Amino acid sequence: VINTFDGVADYLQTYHKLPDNYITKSEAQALGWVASKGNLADVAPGKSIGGDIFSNREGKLPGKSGRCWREADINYTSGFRNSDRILYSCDWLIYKTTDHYQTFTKIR
Numbered sequence: 426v427i428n429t430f431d432g433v434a435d436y437l438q439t440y441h442k443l444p445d446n447y448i449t450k451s452e453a454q455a456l457g458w459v460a461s462k463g464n465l466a467d468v469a470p471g472k473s474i475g476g477d478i479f480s481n482r483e484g485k486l487p488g489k490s491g492r493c494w495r496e497a498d499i500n501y502t503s504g505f506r507n508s509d510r511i512l513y514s515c516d517w518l519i520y521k522t523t524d525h526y527q528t529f530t531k532i533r
Contacts, residue, residue, distance in 0.1 A: 428473050430499055433511050434519050434533045441517075443497055447475030463505035473501040479512055485529055489514050 427436050427444040436444050448469060457468040465472065475497030479486075486494060493515035500509045512520040512529065519533030
């Protein structure tokens with residue numbers, strides 16, 4: 426797998442968690458992921474980076490408490506990470522970005 430905008434959106438709203446194909450950056454690093462080599466697929470076949478706290482330091486997203494915004498990679502399969510991300514709040518507001526957190530639009 427679930428790594429589409431709709432799929433992860435629907436999945437979070439229900440289960441209240443990301444699907445089983447997500448790993449945080451720290452977890453990925455421990456498995457040997459080297460961002461500069463874009464090898465995530467080799468060290469963690471079928472996984473995508475997701476579940477880490479998004480700071481919202483630029484307030485480009487509705488203000489929430491300290492660790493209420495989280496992000497997950499969307500449309501990732503192999504190679505370097507792309508520019509697609511889903512942003513989900515502790516109150517389950519769902520936003521998307523396709524430009525590397527520059528701009529956001531509501532999806533749920």
